[PDB]
Amino acid sequence: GLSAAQRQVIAATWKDIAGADNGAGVGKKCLIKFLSAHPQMAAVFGFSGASDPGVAALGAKVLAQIGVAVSHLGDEGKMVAQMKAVGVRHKGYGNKHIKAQYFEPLGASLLSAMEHRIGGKMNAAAKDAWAAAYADISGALISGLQS
């Protein structure tokens, strides 16, 4: 759960992160860079490498889903149930076992991609709030994945 101050920050910066492509560019950057830094992850996703066009398609889907979770930060219960459902779906995705450990490095790539787009708006308070928001969102997915 996020405090009211954290919720305020996430909601405000999300508008700038979504920009004019519902966050698709952020999702592309996040995954491309993730796979370039951890080559081993391509096989998990079933991608040929960082330049596989499925990287951009999937990055857009992940960011759109984060937008949905943010719209429900007012009702933690809904956010978590929704993310759990996404997590259950992951039971049938990928070519390698999807492990909880993979989520941490993905989170770093995501926060970096957000910063690359909004710059200065990703201040100390935004970095703290987004790390907590990502921990709740990824935590809920993992709970469904592991159920």
Virtual torsion, Cα 87, 89, 91, 96, nearest 10 deg = -90
Instruction: Identify each DSSP E strand in the chain by its residue range.
Output: none
Q: How far is the CB of 5 from ligand HEM (least distance, A)?
A: 22
Of 9 and 79, nearer to ligand HEM (C-beta) is 79
DSSP 90: G
Q: How far is the CB of 120 from ligand HEM (least distance, A)?
A: 25
Nearer CB in complex with ligand HEM: 117/123: 117
Token readout for 35 is 């796979």
Task: For ligand HEM, give the closer residue by CB, 62 or 126.
Answer: 62
38 is in an annotated binding site: no
Q: Are 13 and 130 in contact (CB under 8 A)?
A: yes
Is the Cβ of residue 106 or residue 118 nearer to ligand HEM in the bound state? 106
Which residues in 17-80 belong to E strands, given as ranges?
none
For binding to ligand HEM (CB under 6 A), which residues are involved? 44-46, 58, 61-62, 65-66, 86, 89-90, 93-94, 98, 102-103, 106, 137-138, 141
User: Which residues does a gap of C–N over 2.5 Å follow in the chain?
Assistant: none
* Least CB distance to ligand HEM at residue 93 (A): 4
Binding annotation: 90
